Amino acid sequence: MKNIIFDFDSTLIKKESLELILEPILQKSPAKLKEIEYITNLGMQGDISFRDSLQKRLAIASPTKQSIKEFSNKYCPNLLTDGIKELVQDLKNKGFEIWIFSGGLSESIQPFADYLNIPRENIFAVETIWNSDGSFKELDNSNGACDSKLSAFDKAKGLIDGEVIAIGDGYTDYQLYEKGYATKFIAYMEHIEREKVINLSKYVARNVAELASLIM
Numbered sequence: 001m002k003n004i005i006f007d008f009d010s011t012l013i014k015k016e017s018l019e020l021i022l023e024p025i026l027q028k029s030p031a032k033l034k035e036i037e038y039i040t041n042l043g044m045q046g047d048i049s050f051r052d053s054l055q056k057r058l059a060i061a062s063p064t065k066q067s068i069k070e071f072s073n074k075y076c077p078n079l080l081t082d083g084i085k086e087l088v089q090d091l092k093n094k095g096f097e098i099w100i101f102s103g104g105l106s107e108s109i110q111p112f113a114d115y116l117n118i119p120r121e122n123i124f125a126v127e128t129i130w131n132s133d134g135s136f137k138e139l140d141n142s143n144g145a146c147d148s149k150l151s152a153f154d155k156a157k158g159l160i161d162g163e164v165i166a167i168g169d170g171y172t173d174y175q176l177y178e179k180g181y182a183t184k185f186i187a188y189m190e191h192i193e194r195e196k197v198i199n200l201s202k203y204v205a206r207n208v209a210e211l212a213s214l215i216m
């Protein structure tokens with residue numbers, strides 16, 4: 001009967017996952033990676049829709065099955081926010097159910113969720129279909145995550161009872177509160193300072209101690 005919803009990118013992990021997944025693919029095209037970063041920020045500032053952000057980034061470069069595995073191999077667990085595993089366990093100990101709603105790729109999140117002891121069934125993120133050669137075939141938006149966290153929450157809300165605290169660095173996290181799906185939004189700005197989102201938020205944390213201080 002109480003719930004924490006984390007974003008993954010720049011919240012549970014220190015960086016943006018899709019950019020890191022694509023960086024090897026784009027070593028010869030550094031401007032494309034800067035472009036992907038810029039588009040990510042437009043979506044996370046609420047300047048363009050999340051769907052438009054995701055589609056444009058995938059148009060710039062689409063990942064492969066193996067690119068996600070290489071990302072996991074390199075960055076799980078060292079890319080995790082300082083102190084996050086212990087915070088997650090402290091929250092579980094205090095009775096919170098932990099969820100991840102993200103615009104990152106679900107397959108990239110799973111190893112991290114495993115490490116953090118967050119159930120796999122509690123991850124509502126961007127699902128991908130690969131061709132038999134590992135290349136990108138298409139998104140699978142059955143869960144709504146390719147449109148927004150709002151759509152994903154709407155589809156999943158029968159599984160979520162009671163208070164919901166949304167924690168994240170982006171406008172899409174704020175939207176969960178705006179729409180009333182979350183009872184509280186805490187802007188998480190350890191890794192990035194998003195002025196538009198900070199300005200909308202009543203609560204801001206810049207490390208896991210500050211975050212704990214706002215919740216427990």
Ligand SMILES: [Mg+2]
Nearest residue numbers: 007009010169
């Ligand atoms: Mg984020």
